[PDB]
């Protein structure tokens, strides 16, 4: 670009827009989360971009469907980000 | 004189249509081993649909009938096929859209076996900005399978006579658009041609039921 920004201190917004690899220090866009079951109270921890059917550990209200890039959680499944 | 031996017969279409007489057909008078009622047995009469219904909202459809017997100077016709008018068929082919075509072989309840051709077109949208409106190969097959199954249910359940009168009502084209609109934006859906692959068995009483 003709106009140039600092290459050591990129903004929070600028790094978020960039590709997951083309950042200053590459970081994954994925995360680990747990899903409370609709059927029971147990929380099953799983990858954000899981590539298989996600079942509860108790039963199996299947909690997610793998769809080419991110888990398709059911509309009644609530999750939080595991930090 | 060439026309000294010629006779004119009245043409009668079944009761399904508002107009019962469509014209006159010519045939030579009888001879030694040539009976006119025997000769008028494979004549196919083509008439527009804007004449059998006496309304010009049906004008872009040509209907064909064949003669099955001569009942005293009257040729009792039976339905032989339908086809879109040539001007209408070429007037609905837009350039920057996907054309969807299909054909189904359906056996009616009364025994007739017919072939039905359907045409469709991916459409624009109200807020569409990009010029082209194409569909992926997956969406085309989904749409074709829908219009293939939907047209079979409506045609196999009813006899040939009542199915044809159904085609006059826009229920089938309207229902196809309202059921393929969950896959892609379709606007023009027409049944361009209906054939009769195998003529089912008919009876004089059944024909008499078909003619008054």
């Amino acid at each position: 670009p003709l106009i140039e920004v600092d290459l050591l201190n990129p903004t929070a917004a600028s790094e978020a827009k960039a590709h997951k690899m083309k950042r200053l220090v590459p970081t994954p866009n994925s995360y680990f989360l747990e899903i409370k079951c609709p059927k029971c109270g147990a929380t099953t921890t799983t990858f954000s971009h899981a590539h298989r059917q996600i079942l509860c550990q108790k039963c199996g209200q299947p909690l997610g469907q793998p769809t080419g890039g991110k888990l398709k959680l059911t509309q009644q499944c609530k999750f939080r980000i595991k930090k | 004189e060439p026309f000294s031996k010629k006779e004119w017969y009245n043409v009668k279409v079944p009761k399904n249509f508002k107009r019962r007489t469509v014209g006159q057909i010519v045939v030579n008078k009888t001879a030694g081993t040539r009976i006119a009622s025997e000769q008028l047995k494979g004549r196919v009469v083509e008439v527009n649909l804007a004449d059998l219904m006496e309304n010009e909202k049906f004008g872009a459809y040509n209907y064909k009938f064949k003669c099955e017997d001569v009942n005293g100077k009257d040729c009792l016709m039976i339905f032989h096929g339908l086809k879109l008018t040539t001007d209408k068929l070429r007037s609905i082919v837009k350039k920057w859209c996907t054309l969807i075509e299909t054909s189904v072989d359906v056996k009616t309840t009364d025994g007739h076996l017919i072939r039905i051709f359907c045409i469709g077109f991916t459409s624009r949208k109200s807020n569409q900005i990009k010029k082209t409106s194409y569909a992926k190969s997956a969406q085309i097959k989904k749409i074709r399978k829908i219009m293939n199954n939907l047209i079979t249910k409506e045609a196999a359940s009813r006899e040939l006579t009542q199915f044809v009168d159904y085609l006059r009502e826009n229920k089938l084209p309207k229902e196809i658009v309202a059921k393929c609109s969950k896959v892609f934006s379709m606007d023009n859906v027409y049944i361009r041609k209906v054939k009769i692959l195998k003529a089912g068995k008919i009876d004089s009483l059944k024909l008499l039921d078909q003619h008054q």
Binding site: - | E56, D87, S91, V93
Partner: protein, 95 residues
């Protein structure tokens, strides 16, 4: 050398295209290179439209039109005045 950047064709990401026949010469030209024009005209000329409408047996029958797509080779497009030879700097205009 290269009079045109696209070599006079419309083929970019492929190696072969099917042939079409010139509507006037009968020549074989590739589908992209052919000069494609569309025509939509009434089946009755502007002089005779009044005559047909006078003595007609139909209530308000609307006269149909004819639609056909004409494809011309380069030689028969230039000769038939379908396209003209343009300026060196006006060749680039695509509108």
């Amino acid at each position: 050398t290269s009079k045109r950047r696209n070599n006079g064709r419309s083929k970019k990401g492929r190696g072969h295209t099917q042939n079409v026949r010139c509507s006037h010469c009968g020549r074989c030209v590739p589908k992209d290179k052919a000069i494609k024009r569309y025509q939509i005209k009434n089946i009755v000329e502007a002089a005779a439209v009044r005559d047909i409408s006078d003595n007609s047996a139909l209530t308000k029958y609307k006269l149909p039109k004819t639609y056909m797509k004409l494809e011309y080779c380069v030689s028969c497009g230039i000769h038939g005045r379908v396209v003209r030879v343009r300026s060196r700097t006006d060749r680039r205009n695509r509108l």
